[PDB]
Amino acid sequence: EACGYSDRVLQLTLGNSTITTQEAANSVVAYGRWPEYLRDSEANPVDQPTEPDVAACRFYTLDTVSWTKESRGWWWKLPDALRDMGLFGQNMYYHYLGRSGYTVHVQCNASKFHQGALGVFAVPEMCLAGDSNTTTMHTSYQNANPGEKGGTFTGTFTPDNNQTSPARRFCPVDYLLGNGTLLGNAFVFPHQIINLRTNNCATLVLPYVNSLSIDSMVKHNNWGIAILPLAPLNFASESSPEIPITLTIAPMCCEFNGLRNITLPRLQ
Amino acid sequence: GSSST
Amino acid sequence: GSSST
Amino acid sequence: GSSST
Amino acid sequence: AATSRDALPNTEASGPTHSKEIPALTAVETGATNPLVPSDTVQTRHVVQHRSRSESSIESFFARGACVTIMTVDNPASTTNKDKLFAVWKITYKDTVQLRRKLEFFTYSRFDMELTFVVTANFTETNNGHALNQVYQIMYIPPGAPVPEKWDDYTWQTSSNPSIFYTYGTAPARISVPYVGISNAYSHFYDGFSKVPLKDQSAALGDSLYGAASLNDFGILAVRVVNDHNPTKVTSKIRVYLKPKHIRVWCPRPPRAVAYYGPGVDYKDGTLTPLSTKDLTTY
Amino acid sequence: DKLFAVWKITYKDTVQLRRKLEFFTYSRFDMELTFVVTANFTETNNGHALNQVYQIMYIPPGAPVPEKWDDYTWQTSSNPSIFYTYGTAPARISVPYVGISNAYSHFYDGFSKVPLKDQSAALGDSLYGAASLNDFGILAVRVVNDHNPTK
Amino acid sequence: AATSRDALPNTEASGPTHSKEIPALTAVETGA
Amino acid sequence: GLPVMNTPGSNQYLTADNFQSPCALPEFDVTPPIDIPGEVKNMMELAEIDTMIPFDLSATKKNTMEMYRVRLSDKPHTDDPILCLSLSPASDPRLSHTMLGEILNYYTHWAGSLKFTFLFCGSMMATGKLLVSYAPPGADPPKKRKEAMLGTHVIWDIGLQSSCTMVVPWISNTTYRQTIDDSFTEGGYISVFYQTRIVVPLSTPREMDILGFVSACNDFSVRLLRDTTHIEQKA
Amino acid sequence: GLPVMNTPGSNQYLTADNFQSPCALPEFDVTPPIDIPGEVKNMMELAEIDTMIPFDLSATKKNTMEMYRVRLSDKPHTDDPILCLSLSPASDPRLSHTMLGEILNYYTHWAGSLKFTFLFCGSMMATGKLLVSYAPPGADPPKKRKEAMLGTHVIWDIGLQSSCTMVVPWISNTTYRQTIDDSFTEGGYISVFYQTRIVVPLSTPREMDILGFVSACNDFSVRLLRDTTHIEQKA
Amino acid sequence: FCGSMMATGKLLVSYAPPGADPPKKRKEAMLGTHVIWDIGLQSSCTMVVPWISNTTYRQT
Amino acid sequence: GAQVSSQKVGAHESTINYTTINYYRDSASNAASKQDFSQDPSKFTEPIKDVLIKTAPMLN
Amino acid sequence: GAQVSSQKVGAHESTINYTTINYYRDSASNAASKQDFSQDPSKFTEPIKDVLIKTAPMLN
Amino acid sequence: GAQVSSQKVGAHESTINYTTINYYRDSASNAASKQDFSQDPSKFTEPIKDVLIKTAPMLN
Ligand SMILES: CCCCCCCCCCCCC/C=C\[C@H](O)[C@H](N)CO
Ligand SMILES: CCCCCCCCCCCCC/C=C\[C@H](O)[C@H](N)CO
Numbered sequence A: 001e002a003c004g005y006s007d008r009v010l011q012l013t014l015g016n017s018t019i020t021t022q023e024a025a026n027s028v029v030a031y032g033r034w035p036e037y038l039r040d041s042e043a044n045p046v047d048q049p050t051e052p053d054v055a056a057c058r059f060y061t062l063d064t065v066s067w068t069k070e071s072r073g074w075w076w077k078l079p080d081a082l083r084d085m086g087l088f089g090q091n092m093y094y095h096y097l098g099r100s101g102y103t104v105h106v107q108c109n110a111s112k113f114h115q116g117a118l119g120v121f122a123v124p125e126m127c128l129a130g131d132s133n134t135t136t137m138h139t140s141y142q143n144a145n146p147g148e149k150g151g152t153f154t155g156t157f158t159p160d161n162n163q164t165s166p167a168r169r170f171c172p173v174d175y176l177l178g179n180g181t182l183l184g185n186a187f188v189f190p191h192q193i194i195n196l197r198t199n200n201c202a203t204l205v206l207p208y209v210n211s212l213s214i215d216s217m218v219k220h221n222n223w224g225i226a227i228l229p230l231a232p233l234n235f236a237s238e239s240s241p242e243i244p245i246t247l248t249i250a251p252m253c254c255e256f257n258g259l260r261n262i263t264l265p266r267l268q
Numbered sequence B, C, D: 001g002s003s004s005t
Numbered sequence E: 001a002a003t004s005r006d007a008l009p010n011t012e013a014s015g016p017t018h019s020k021e022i023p024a025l026t027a028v029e030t031g032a033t034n035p036l037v038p039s040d041t042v043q044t045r046h047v048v049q050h051r052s053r054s055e056s057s058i059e060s061f062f063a064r065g066a067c068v069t070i071m072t073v074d075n076p077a078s079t080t081n082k083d084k085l086f087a088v089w090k091i092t093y094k095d096t097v098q099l100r101r102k103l104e105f106f107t108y109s110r111f112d113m114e115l116t117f118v119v120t121a122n123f124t125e126t127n128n129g130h131a132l133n134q135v136y137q138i139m140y141i142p143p144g145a146p147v148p149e150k151w152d153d154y155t156w157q158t159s160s161n162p163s164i165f166y167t168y169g170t171a172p173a174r175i176s177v178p179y180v181g182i183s184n185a186y187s188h189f190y191d192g193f194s195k196v197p198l199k200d201q202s203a204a205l206g207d208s209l210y211g212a213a214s215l216n217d218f219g220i221l222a223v224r225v226v227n228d229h230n231p232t233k234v235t236s237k238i239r240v241y242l243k244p245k246h247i248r249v250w251c252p253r254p255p256r257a258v259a260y261y262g263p264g265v266d267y268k269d270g271t272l273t274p275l276s277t278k279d280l281t282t283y
Numbered sequence F: 001d002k003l004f005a006v007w008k009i010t011y012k013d014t015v016q017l018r019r020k021l022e023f024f025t026y027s028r029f030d031m032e033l034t035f036v037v038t039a040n041f042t043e044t045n046n047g048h049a050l051n052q053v054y055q056i057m058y059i060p061p062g063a064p065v066p067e068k069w070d071d072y073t074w075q076t077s078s079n080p081s082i083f084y085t086y087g088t089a090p091a092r093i094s095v096p097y098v099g100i101s102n103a104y105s106h107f108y109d110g111f112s113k114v115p116l117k118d119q120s121a122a123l124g125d126s127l128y129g130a131a132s133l134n135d136f137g138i139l140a141v142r143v144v145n146d147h148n149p150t151k
Numbered sequence G: 001a002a003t004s005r006d007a008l009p010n011t012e013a014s015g016p017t018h019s020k021e022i023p024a025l026t027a028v029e030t031g032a
Numbered sequence H, I: 001g002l003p004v005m006n007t008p009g010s011n012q013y014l015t016a017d018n019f020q021s022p023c024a025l026p027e028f029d030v031t032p033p034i035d036i037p038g039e040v041k042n043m044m045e046l047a048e049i050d051t052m053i054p055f056d057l058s059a060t061k062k063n064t065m066e067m068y069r070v071r072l073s074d075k076p077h078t079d080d081p082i083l084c085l086s087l088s089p090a091s092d093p094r095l096s097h098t099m100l101g102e103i104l105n106y107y108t109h110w111a112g113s114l115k116f117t118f119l120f121c122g123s124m125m126a127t128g129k130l131l132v133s134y135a136p137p138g139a140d141p142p143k144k145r146k147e148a149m150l151g152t153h154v155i156w157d158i159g160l161q162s163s164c165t166m167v168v169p170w171i172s173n174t175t176y177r178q179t180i181d182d183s184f185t186e187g188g189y190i191s192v193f194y195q196t197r198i199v200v201p202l203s204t205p206r207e208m209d210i211l212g213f214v215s216a217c218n219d220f221s222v223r224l225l226r227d228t229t230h231i232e233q234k235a
Numbered sequence J: 001f002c003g004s005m006m007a008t009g010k011l012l013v014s015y016a017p018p019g020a021d022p023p024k025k026r027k028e029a030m031l032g033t034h035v036i037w038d039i040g041l042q043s044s045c046t047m048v049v050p051w052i053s054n055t056t057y058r059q060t
Numbered sequence K, L, M: 001g002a003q004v005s006s007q008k009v010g011a012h013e014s015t016i017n018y019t020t021i022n023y024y025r026d027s028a029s030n031a032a033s034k035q036d037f038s039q040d041p042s043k044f045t046e047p048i049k050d051v052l053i054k055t056a057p058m059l060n
């Protein structure tokens, strides 16, 4: 626009929180579907839902991670990454059922002299492969669910050979998208790329996706966020560059059914 | 001929 | 009777 | 219905 | 209103260009694919396009019976020490790999299921005895119903379970089944558990498999030779073919690139190198 | 090993239909394939065999050709297969005009490769009159029944 | 006129209550 | 009874047939659909999405993240290729495993236009002009800019619009090509060259990567369904 | 004869099929119906009738009249449960043999709301307030009033209306639950507590029984017919 | 921001209404009213502290 | 003499119909239509002489 | 209850048609019509919030 | 969807007809109609640029 408006300069406001950006590459709405509340024609639990609105549908910032030349990639699951975020987490653990959409805003700035490209992928049902070649489907709830710290990808599959006390964790190999399919094809999932010369953020608006209208948020993750260096970090002629990556995520149109006492999960 | 339900 | 597509 | 040739 | 067998768009003739319009220049960071056609970057002629995408519609892509299992049964001499073998199979598309890979291009699906049964038999001992024509019973045992412990126990009565009595040497058996899921679609992938581990409960008690939902998802097929024991032993195999009719699919996925390793997405060491050597500047 | 058969589809292994089609240079047609199946005993034995089921799998150019009578390819998730039961009416299917050209060429006065000067002779070489190496693919046939004492 | 394959009744939205209407209280002795 | 005569084909099981059959669960209460996002109606929709090419399948780079990275540098201008690729979307090892390549391996025949988009991942301070080429088949495959220039091409100027697309127009003798390496239905040559050179100021990385993507155009189609070779089940 | 081609499925006997067949007794004079009272049109009508729960299946009380009796007494207030029950109507041993439970064992899937009605069988002089609870699944099963209070519940005041009903509303992730013990389709927890305490005057029994009943609501349905495990014929 | 044009950065500006522990870590400040400021050509960024009070007027 | 009825279509790929012709004189030979009626459970669930109003006391 | 549809005639020797009658009550028993619809790839190829004009800069 | 055509009746015992219904979606599955056309041989027997009048000299 002739009044200055740009594809690169955005402001997002949800609840008491605002994000600004001056170097965006537009923003993505997964499968063209904006988040919505559950419609009466598709409804299933009959009890009055709880809809916390601004108390939970607001931007929560997770712990900042660090991108270096040796970084192989990071992953998070939703709603798991937000399980301890203010009243969203509370509403989640107090109810049997819950559904939610999300605005995911990945942040990573550098300089006109740095280079590198992060693929930011939102995957529905992001099932990851385990560390074992003696047992399949054996990743424990605790290791499947890191909360806000997330997990990481590795360039090497390395099998857990301790059969007495198995690690029971994922071993997500990067070029195999951690699930046995080639990373170059991950672009069929809703995504953006943070290519440092072009943009300093990625914004993905995610609808609630599931084979059900509502489900157990505590037992099941709907979306996975996978961030992988498609082109490695590089700066001037430094051997060990570092730039931070920060995730800020907002639940959207979240509603909960089946209120009871609070769930207290075994997370370690 | 034909019935229709 | 008959439908026609 | 029916065609006729 | 556009149908799968409609012809694709015509190429329109386009001439030389010199402008500020830049179709060729784009920015894939946005998450979008540049919607270009040849007339955007070269000079084209007018072509009346006749080709269609009819054979790649979801229905047409899946419109084939795929083998999902081979069940083994027999009918021995009455004098045998070993019991008469009847077969029990937990219904799934994950025991074989081909239909599995095709369904897994997508996250979720809805379809009516067509099951076709091909049945073959043979002699095993280098005998000279005969066997009269066999009738097989293919019983569907839904989760909860009593599973047969013997080839001839009470469950084969089937008052409520559906059974097919197939006669050897006749056309392969076939039945259809509606969309029977307990969800609004079948989940090809479930990133979750069927139990929450609670702190106040032991680890064992809160434990469950990663990615597994209902333990007995769809039940069992149990197959037997209905004929009584015969002096000469005959062994038979029932090959089950699954075709997804009236199908809908959601959320596309990259196809399986390394060998399947169990019902989950797990992979085995030593199978992780699908790609072959090829030099960057070699055609 | 248990013999399964592999045939590259063509009308040129026999002579009669070939001569009739060759009254013309080009053709378009839908193809009707009918399969007559006969069996016999070979060893002067006295053993029997139960009725056989045959699998006739169409393997289009590119799809994996069976190496064993019982390997994974016989799954046929996408290739068309006919499971024929012995002693029933001969099997039959139809196929549309499947050519990659607007007509079938009964004669192709040309090669599938241009020999370039800058390339070796071997590298530019190809057979006279042959176009696609695997024109229409393969039919692979097997007895689905397991091994039997009497062959 | 209600058929076996007809959908069952919709759940109607209902809010809070404070009245002399007592649906929860009953008496099974009646046979009902 | 009605006089009937059994025809050939009677009692066979064709796996591609389309007949009615009895329902094993009559009057079953089916669960209704819900409007799940992401419904696909045709496999070619997936082929029209850009997926990334594993260009550098060298012995040490193949089956690692590195295979997707094409390395450029600020070296003096050369007329020698950055990369060379055969237009055999289902069989050339660099294309066959892309989403397009994968879908094509379930079909025997493909036709239509394609497009290659390259992404420059160097720093903002890096400039450069590259030449992206498509030579239809029949001549010596281009190994020098001089030859590649003569065919279909796009001269890419690097700048704020990070990416550039070259459309490979459907140019074929046959109405459909085979999804295998075949000389009769060969597609020709994709190649990339330095038009000028990559230039960087001081204090800047002198080497960088470009990434490449392939997707189908709206005039693209496939036919004759078949089993892939990209998966197997030995034993 | 009319040219015909035999399809797959030909000559099979599917026990669930629905075909015509010849009548062995043609022109038989059928006896007309009479209007017998008690006609049933659908098995769910039977599921909507209250039948009594065998709550106390202790080793000495099971398979005796005593299993239907839940004993209360006028003891000082406690926050400890009178009873605890899993919402697994076809598989929990206390529910599986009720008329609802029995019908559900001929089906694989159930859905809808349920209701529990309790009958106080103490004397007119006995008073009391009880808390009846339903906790949807996912948390620690309530063992104290404190937790049960937080879920769906009815505080029952004992008086002239002898009975009280708690409706277990359909609250599920799946559109249908399995008729077996299954964690994915688990239903949660039914429990009963003392809200105040049972109080009696002198010359009155200090202990009494309550009886419990379960039935389906009008939104309740079942599907996928199956054989039950509740009867067998060994030999 | 008065650094050079070549300097980039994202900052979080926060307002926590009273009653809890005053934020000493981003984790707490994030939970209140805030603006995430991206540094760039528009040199400045504004966070509005909305009137959120129990009393109709506060003391000076 | 053809009977044309509609199917309740569960999974989808207008009204889809199916055709039925009876081939025999005896209705006993006919297949089952499955076109069945439902009824209210009242004769079993509320067999009481005086109509029950659920918001009212069952006993007055 | 007969359904009459046209064939897309490939090789030739008016509109040629074919007839279909459903024999069963359950739509699950029906063959596949193959009368399917196509859709635009946009939800996957252009999932961006602001509509893309291909002649314009993707970034402005 | 029935097609009714006449037979060319050779040996005799009005127009005698026969009926055809296509059972499949694909025209490839159809039988052959044998309702074929003839053409003039001229493209092979008289391929000359100037029309031949047979009573006239072929060469003038
Ligand atoms: C007499 C034979 C009757 C056969 C009855 C079979 C009924 C069971 C149908 C099974 C449906 C299997 C669907 C495929 C798998 C699911 O997609 C995934 N595992 C997700 O739920
Ligand atoms: C389950 C059985 C399926 C059988 C499928 C067969 C498909 C292949 C059709 C082959 C068409 C052969 C046509 C004849 C030959 C060509 O005229 C000439 N060689 C020129 O192209």
Ligand SMILES: *C(=O)CCCCCCCCCCCCC
Pocket (backbone or CB within 6 Å): B001, B002, K001, K002, K021, K022, K023, K024
């Ligand atoms: C009513 O039925 C008039 C229409 C007739 C339609 C064709 C009947 C198909 C064959 C039925 C044969 C008779 C059964 C004994």
Ligand SMILES: *C(=O)CCCCCCCCCCCCC
Pocket (backbone or CB within 6 Å): B002, C001, C002, K002, K004, K019, K020, K021, L001, L002, L021, L022, L023, L024
């Ligand atoms: C609509 O179908 C009315 C016309 C009937 C045409 C003849 C039907 C052919 C036989 C169908 C038999 C019934 C299938 C159970």
Ligand SMILES: *C(=O)CCCCCCCCCCCCC
Pocket (backbone or CB within 6 Å): C002, D001, D002, L002, L004, L019, L020, L021, M001, M002, M021, M022, M023, M024
């Ligand atoms: C046009 O066909 C309308 C008249 C229908 C006449 C009876 C059809 C006979 C049975 C055809 C069955 C369908 C073939 C799949």
